[PDB]
Amino acid sequence: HMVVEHPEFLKAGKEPGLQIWRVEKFDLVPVPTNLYGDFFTGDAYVILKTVQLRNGNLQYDLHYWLGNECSQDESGAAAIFTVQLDDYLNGRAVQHREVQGFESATFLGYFKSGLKYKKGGVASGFKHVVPNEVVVQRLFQVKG
Amino acid sequence: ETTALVCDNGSGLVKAGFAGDDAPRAVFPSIVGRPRHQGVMVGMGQKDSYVGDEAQSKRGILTLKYPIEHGIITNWDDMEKIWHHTFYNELRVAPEEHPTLLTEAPLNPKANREKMTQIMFETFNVPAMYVAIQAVLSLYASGRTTGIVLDSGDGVTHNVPIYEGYALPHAIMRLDLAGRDLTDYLMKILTERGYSFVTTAEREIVRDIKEKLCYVALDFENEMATAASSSSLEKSYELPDGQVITIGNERFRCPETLFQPSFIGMESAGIHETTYNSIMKCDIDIRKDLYANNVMSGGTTMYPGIADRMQKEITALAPSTMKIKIIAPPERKYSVWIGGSILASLSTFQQMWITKQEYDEAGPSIVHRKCF
Amino acid sequence: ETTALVCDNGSGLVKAGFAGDDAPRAVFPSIVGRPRHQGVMVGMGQKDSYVGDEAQSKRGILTLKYPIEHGIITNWDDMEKIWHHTFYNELRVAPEEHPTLLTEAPLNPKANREKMTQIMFETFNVPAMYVAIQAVLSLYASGRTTGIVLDSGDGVTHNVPIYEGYALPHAIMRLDLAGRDLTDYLMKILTERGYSFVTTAEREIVRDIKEKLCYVALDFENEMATAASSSSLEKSYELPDGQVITIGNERFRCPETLFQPSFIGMESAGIHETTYNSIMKCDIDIRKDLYANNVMSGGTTMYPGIADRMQKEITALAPSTMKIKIIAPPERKYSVWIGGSILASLSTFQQMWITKQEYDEAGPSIVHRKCF
Ligand SMILES: Nc1ncnc2c1ncn2[C@@H]1O[C@H](COP(=O)(O)OP(=O)(O)OP(=O)(O)O)[C@@H](O)[C@H]1O
Ligand SMILES: Nc1ncnc2c1ncn2[C@@H]1O[C@H](COP(=O)(O)OP(=O)(O)O)[C@@H](O)[C@H]1O
Ligand SMILES: [Ca+2]
Ligand SMILES: [Ca+2]
Ligand SMILES: [Ca+2]
Ligand SMILES: [Ca+2]
């Protein structure tokens, strides 16, 4: 349960509300406020809601949302950032996995207007390699 | 500016490459070969110890030893030869410039972790280092934070429950049969056709036969009956000296040792109900998503039909009031490396490295307090 | 009222006789001799092939072939000649009214087992037959029921652990190194003193030299130093053409291939490691009496000093609390035949006989179900 000191995590879960982050190349960027409630189909998202209780404590709820066209690095980074944001907190949050088109009814409950999806997204941070590939065509003269 | 290295040290197949890649750059078997004859043509590049895939190439004239057995490093000097071959010959990099991420088996003893730290910082002189676990990187590569992982490689089979991104040590269960024992059983049951494979050189041939021509039968008895009656599943293989062997009912009998350990005289449980025995050891509330997330990882999950058979065998003895789904990505033989490559390339990982000066004023004991 | 026949068909010798007797009536080597020169004198008694001792008495003008090479049967017409000779010429009995007990080495290819049935009911027309494991007959001949048998003859050398009268199939080990390989190695190392032996007749002579003048050294390096420092270990042998040869350290180097197989270039371990790993693959509670009941069988265990060397090597490998007893009866050359002779003569045995009726309603597959 080693804590992390990512500088964007310092503004997370301090006042009752709802916070959205997008994964762009192994990093989180908070999407602006008027782009809330709608998502790209090829990106991964981290969703936080914090709720004030009657007795004074402040509960937390993490979701991580994966589109049907997101790559492996975006979904894996979303899962690891969800875990690390739970560890930055004192383990008081419950995590949920959200898939595009098969969301929970409570996930539909957070957004007032509803969910609407666009094509496209930010490109993946991976670069393509194949294991054990050589493409070589040379000729050597040995002489002496 | 510099790029981290990921090195997944398997018991029979070591993977290595650079962080931020979608595939490992190098996959080569973790063997050390030593010569068994005398080199009479002197001055023609004879070495006292051939390491890695080169030792796989001239495997006839060598004796082969595995430095890692059952997931745990036992012979340490050969493991230094594996790491030296990995850094200098294979990846062709200086270890002084690159941070290095390593992976370990679950329930690793502490002394092996400290000794891994000591040879990592003293012998090769890395500037940073980190140790991770096989199954949690498999689950991160699957895009999940909660699930059971059946990681079955060459040495051991591990069932690891992970809840909220952390493993549960009271329910991690180790079953000690894998593709090495399947290979040995296939050498046992090829003797009745008249083919003999005795030394370690042609164990690799039997491993190639097991990889190319094996499948998991959905039902065993009717498959045996159709194998006995007809000859529609008998197929041929070409040995590298030119002889052609043919294999019939042994094509599907050899994966069945995972579901029935009594085929090799092992009194333990099959791979399907040890996951049930692991999931009964967990808390009652968390079993709903733990049954739904059945992550298969490792190279011996790459048989055709193993997912449908695993679905049937879990669905038989779990209660009928719940749904079971088995997931099997096509990259599951490299998934630990994929999770490590995602983990090393993050923007929150630069503070989680174990730097050189922290090891200098901490010794080989800071690896427990940081890799946790 | 009919007397059953017991016919142990080894790789180098055939031991045949009647059930209930104490010694086998016919012992003769399993060879087929064919002429290789030009016959110039007409009439007389020239035959196209000679079998057994008649081939040994005329071996100067014959090429000799063994039907059995390393346990498996290669030539079946020659093996039919061997069976015809041992029925009609040696035992001089008609085989259509005597049930015939046959013996077989374990981990044999299955295709021999029905094929041995396929001659016996079709050509000779025996009323019944049975196939038994050689190691359990050797253990029964010692009066024991639990123990480990090292059976080493002319073709193969196998370790079989037996508990409660049944062999454990997951711990039987086979080593393809026996008396013919030691004979070939002795032909190889007699060229160092200048003696050339290339003919199959000369192979028979070197086999005789190996039987008369070889022993197992208790420690190899001290015995080599003793043979280097003096000539007290040298012995003389007279060839049948009157030539006298002298052998020194080669007396004990030729049994040492049993304990160090790397002399003839094999990666596999010695017979004592084979016995130790055969014991180690058994259950933990029955290892106490496997070390204490270690019988030896076959003609290749007839060297002087083999039992003391075996106890020395097993004692160094076993834990010190264990008690080691190597059991070497003087009748161990014919112990397979004695166990078969007692086992066939019992009044309670006449329902395990595979008779003609179930064979010709079941085909050549009854031997896989009634003979375990
Ligand atoms: N297609 C395949 N079918 C069957 N077996 C396979 C296949 N591909 C690989 N294997 C086997 O999988 C094993 C290697 O898998 P993997 O690299 O995941 O294991 P590892 O990391 O070496 O082992 P471990 O995790 O136990 O230390 C070998 O035994 C290999 O024979
Ligand atoms: N006194 C002896 N010393 C050493 N070896 C012997 C001796 N007698 C027989 N042998 C070897 O035993 C082998 C045959 O053993 P045995 O098991 O009786 O026959 P088979 O192997 O045909 O069943 C022969 O190859 C022979 O070389
Ligand atoms: Ca994307
Ligand atoms: Ca939590
Ligand atoms: Ca692995
Ligand atoms: Ca024999």
Side-chain angles (χ1 to χ4, degrees):
Chain A
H1 59 85
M2 183 177 177
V3 293
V4 295
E5 291 80 3
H6 182 73
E8 199 271 330
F9 293 172
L10 275 294
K11 63 177 75 65
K14 309 291 175 320
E15 60 93 24
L18 188 148
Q19 292 181 356
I20 311 295
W21 298 277
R22 180 178 170 187
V23 183
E24 298 86 356
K25 295 181 175 66
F26 320 106
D27 204 355
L28 293 163
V29 176
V31 69
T33 303
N34 62 84
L35 273 294
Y36 271 34
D38 54 354
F39 294 112
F40 285 110
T41 194
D43 278 5
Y45 283 93
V46 175
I47 315 296
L48 182 60
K49 189 172 176 64
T50 187
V51 174
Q52 187 70 66
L53 274 296
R54 281 82 65 193
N55 59 0
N57 80 351
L58 183 65
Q59 70 179 359
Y60 296 108
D61 191 0
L62 277 296
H63 311 69
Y64 59 100
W65 184 95
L66 313 185
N68 292 116
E69 289 80 2
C70 70
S71 51
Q72 197 155 4
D73 56 294
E74 291 170 327
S75 67
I80 294 159
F81 279 137
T82 301
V83 169
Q84 288 179 356
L85 197 65
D86 199 348
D87 289 293
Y88 172 61
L89 275 58
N90 304 345
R92 293 179 65 254
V94 296
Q95 300 152 28
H96 295 91
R97 195 163 161 287
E98 298 293 328
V99 194
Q100 183 211 344
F102 290 73
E103 294 83 357
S104 56
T106 185
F107 196 79
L108 277 296
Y110 296 118
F111 300 134
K112 276 74 70 176
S113 312
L115 278 296
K116 58 179 75 66
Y117 309 140
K118 276 74 69 177
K119 300 289 94 176
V122 71
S124 83
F126 282 169
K127 59 179 75 66
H128 187 52
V129 302
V130 182
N132 299 117
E133 183 178 1
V134 295
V135 177
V136 177
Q137 185 176 1
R138 319 187 274 168
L139 178 75
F140 295 97
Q141 185 195 38
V142 300
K143 182 178 174 67
Chain B
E1 194 274 328
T2 193
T3 59
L5 308 196
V6 192
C7 197
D8 175 36
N9 292 313
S11 68
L13 191 65
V14 64
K15 277 76 71 175
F18 289 89
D21 293 332
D22 62 338
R25 192 86 83 71
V27 185
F28 65 100
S30 66
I31 51 169
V32 174
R34 287 182 176 81
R36 54 184 286 189
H37 301 96
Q38 265 190 355
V40 308
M41 288 185 76
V42 293
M44 295 300 291
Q46 294 82 17
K47 293 188 286 295
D48 284 324
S49 177
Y50 295 87
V51 176
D53 207 315
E54 156 165 30
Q56 192 92 323
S57 74
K58 56 176 78 67
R59 66 194 175 184
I61 53 162
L62 301 174
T63 185
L64 308 186
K65 288 196 287 180
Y66 280 88
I68 297 161
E69 65 92 21
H70 300 338
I72 313 304
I73 296 158
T74 58
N75 192 356
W76 279 95
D77 299 331
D78 289 331
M79 187 66 204
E80 303 206 52
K81 292 180 178 66
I82 294 304
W83 275 320
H84 186 282
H85 181 275
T86 303
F87 288 133
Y88 291 111
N89 177 37
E90 188 66 30
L91 292 182
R92 204 78 64 167
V93 289
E96 290 83 2
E97 292 180 352
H98 299 252
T100 302
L101 177 64
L102 312 172
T103 67
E104 81 203 327
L107 299 190
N108 208 357
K110 288 172 73 174
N112 303 115
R113 189 191 291 276
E114 300 194 339
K115 190 161 178 177
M116 185 180 288
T117 288
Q118 210 177 6
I119 293 89
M120 200 84 257
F121 277 106
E122 296 291 329
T123 303
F124 302 115
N125 184 216
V126 300
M129 183 278 288
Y130 195 69
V131 191
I133 288 151
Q134 297 293 321
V136 302
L137 296 176
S138 285
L139 191 71
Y140 295 156
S142 73
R144 289 148 153 90
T145 60
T146 300
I148 191 77
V149 169
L150 188 147
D151 192 0
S152 70
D154 208 343
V156 293
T157 295
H158 273 298
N159 284 311
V160 177
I162 301 102
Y163 174 65
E164 297 276 87
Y166 280 88
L168 314 184
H170 71 270
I172 289 163
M173 307 213 317
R174 167 164 142 152
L175 190 68
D176 194 0
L177 79 166
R180 177 64 174 278
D181 292 333
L182 300 176
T183 302
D184 292 3
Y185 180 70
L186 181 51
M187 310 209 270
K188 183 67 72 173
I189 63 160
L190 283 194
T191 46
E192 55 260 25
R193 299 292 184 88
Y195 319 128
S196 59
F197 303 96
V198 294
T199 63
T200 51
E202 62 268 20
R203 185 181 291 159
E204 303 296 325
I205 301 177
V206 180
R207 189 184 48 66
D208 272 28
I209 293 159
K210 177 255 282 182
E211 289 176 355
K212 295 287 182 71
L213 297 170
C214 279
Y215 69 99
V216 176
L218 185 63
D219 189 2
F220 187 61
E221 286 78 2
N222 57 1
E223 193 68 26
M224 286 280 274
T226 50
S229 67
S230 71
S231 179
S232 44
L233 56 91
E234 188 174 2
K235 286 184 285 295
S236 303
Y237 184 89
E238 195 274 333
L239 295 169
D241 62 349
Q243 293 149 242
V244 176
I245 56 171
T246 184
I247 187 166
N249 59 357
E250 301 109 313
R251 203 192 171 212
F252 57 89
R253 281 209 291 122
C254 175
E256 289 287 325
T257 312
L258 296 151
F259 300 94
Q260 292 162 77
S262 44
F263 281 17
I264 55 165
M266 185 180 288
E267 69 275 16
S268 68
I271 54 160
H272 61 274
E273 73 280 22
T274 175
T275 68
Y276 192 83
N277 291 320
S278 75
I279 197 166
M280 290 291 105
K281 288 179 181 180
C282 294
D283 195 359
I284 191 69
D285 57 349
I286 58 171
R287 310 188 166 158
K288 300 291 102 176
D289 59 351
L290 190 54
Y291 269 119
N293 297 322
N294 289 307
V295 175
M296 294 177 71
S297 179
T300 56
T301 63
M302 287 288 329
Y303 298 89
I306 189 164
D308 296 330
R309 172 60 174 272
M310 267 277 294
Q311 177 69 48
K312 159 181 190 198
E313 293 277 23
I314 298 295
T315 305
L317 59 84
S320 190
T321 62
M322 64 184 73
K323 64 91 175 179
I324 302 289
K325 67 189 289 295
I326 306 296
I327 54 171
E331 66 275 16
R332 57 190 180 279
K333 66 187 287 187
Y334 302 144
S335 63
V336 176
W337 197 94
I338 302 299
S341 182
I342 295 161
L343 196 65
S345 64
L346 290 177
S347 72
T348 68
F349 201 71
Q350 62 270 20
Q351 62 268 19
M352 293 177 71
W353 286 116
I354 296 151
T355 61
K356 184 66 172 63
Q357 69 275 17
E358 294 175 355
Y359 172 82
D360 278 14
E361 60 250 19
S365 184
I366 192 164
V367 69
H368 308 278
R369 68 180 65 252
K370 284 176 78 74
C371 313
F372 154 75
Chain C
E1 61 185 0
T2 59
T3 306
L5 314 177
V6 177
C7 179
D8 179 23
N9 291 164
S11 310
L13 279 160
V14 167
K15 280 80 73 175
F18 294 89
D21 286 17
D22 62 357
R25 190 179 293 279
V27 173
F28 67 100
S30 70
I31 50 161
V32 168
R34 291 180 187 278
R36 71 205 199 76
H37 292 306
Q38 184 62 255
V40 298
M41 293 177 70
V42 301
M44 187 179 288
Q46 289 88 21
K47 294 188 285 185
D48 64 292
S49 86
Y50 300 89
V51 185
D53 271 316
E54 187 63 26
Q56 285 287 329
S57 69
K58 293 174 159 182
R59 64 154 179 270
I61 53 166
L62 297 193
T63 188
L64 301 192
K65 298 299 186 42
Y66 281 84
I68 293 160
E69 192 274 329
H70 293 345
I72 62 170
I73 293 159
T74 73
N75 192 304
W76 285 93
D77 294 329
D78 288 11
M79 188 66 204
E80 275 180 82
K81 289 182 179 67
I82 289 281
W83 275 319
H84 190 283
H85 177 78
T86 188
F87 291 152
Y88 289 108
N89 303 329
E90 295 292 328
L91 298 169
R92 67 180 65 252
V93 71
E96 65 269 18
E97 66 280 22
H98 293 285
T100 310
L101 172 54
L102 297 170
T103 62
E104 190 183 5
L107 294 174
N108 202 6
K110 285 180 187 292
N112 292 322
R113 294 178 65 82
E114 61 263 19
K115 189 66 179 291
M116 293 180 183
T117 313
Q118 184 60 35
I119 295 90
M120 286 282 126
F121 286 113
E122 280 72 358
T123 78
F124 307 115
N125 307 352
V126 300
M129 61 80 71
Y130 188 91
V131 176
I133 298 97
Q134 293 175 354
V136 299
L137 296 172
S138 292
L139 188 63
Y140 287 153
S142 180
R144 277 69 171 276
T145 308
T146 303
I148 187 160
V149 182
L150 171 67
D151 206 310
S152 179
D154 191 281
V156 296
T157 293
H158 51 276
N159 281 109
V160 176
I162 297 141
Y163 177 74
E164 298 288 328
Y166 292 130
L168 308 171
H170 311 288
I172 295 160
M173 292 180 183
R174 167 178 275 229
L175 174 71
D176 307 85
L177 194 152
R180 213 172 300 173
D181 294 329
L182 303 189
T183 296
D184 291 322
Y185 184 53
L186 185 52
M187 299 216 282
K188 185 177 178 291
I189 61 162
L190 282 191
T191 60
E192 292 175 353
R193 303 193 95 94
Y195 314 129
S196 179
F197 295 117
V198 286
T199 293
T200 53
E202 294 172 336
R203 162 182 272 92
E204 289 300 305
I205 295 167
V206 170
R207 192 268 306 283
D208 192 65
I209 293 169
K210 180 193 75 148
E211 291 179 353
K212 302 270 192 69
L213 286 179
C214 279
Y215 69 102
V216 187
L218 183 50
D219 52 348
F220 185 49
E221 289 80 1
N222 196 358
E223 197 81 5
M224 285 280 270
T226 300
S229 70
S230 70
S231 67
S232 56
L233 298 170
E234 289 184 353
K235 296 291 186 185
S236 286
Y237 182 88
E238 175 163 336
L239 303 194
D241 66 340
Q243 294 177 355
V244 173
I245 57 169
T246 296
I247 53 169
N249 60 307
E250 299 99 334
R251 291 181 67 194
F252 61 88
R253 268 164 71 208
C254 169
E256 281 285 326
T257 314
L258 289 181
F259 295 85
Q260 292 183 356
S262 71
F263 284 7
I264 57 167
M266 293 177 70
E267 184 178 1
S268 75
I271 53 168
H272 58 279
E273 281 96 359
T274 308
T275 314
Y276 176 63
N277 294 118
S278 187
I279 284 156
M280 277 297 102
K281 291 180 76 65
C282 293
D283 200 73
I284 190 68
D285 59 350
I286 58 167
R287 300 220 191 108
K288 182 67 181 294
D289 59 351
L290 284 177
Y291 281 119
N293 304 62
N294 196 330
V295 299
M296 294 187 333
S297 181
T300 310
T301 61
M302 281 303 282
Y303 294 86
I306 186 150
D308 296 331
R309 187 74 145 80
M310 269 276 303
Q311 189 170 0
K312 178 177 184 293
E313 294 287 324
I314 292 290
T315 302
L317 269 162
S320 65
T321 59
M322 295 296 172
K323 187 67 69 64
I324 311 305
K325 291 183 177 68
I326 304 301
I327 294 153
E331 67 276 1
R332 57 174 174 283
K333 194 181 282 184
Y334 312 120
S335 70
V336 174
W337 190 93
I338 291 158
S341 175
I342 301 299
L343 188 141
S345 65
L346 298 181
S347 65
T348 60
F349 195 63
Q350 289 81 15
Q351 63 279 18
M352 283 73 74
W353 277 124
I354 294 165
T355 75
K356 185 68 169 65
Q357 285 74 241
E358 61 267 25
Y359 171 64
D360 57 16
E361 63 87 20
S365 65
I366 191 70
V367 74
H368 279 300
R369 291 187 289 109
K370 282 177 74 67
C371 288
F372 308 140

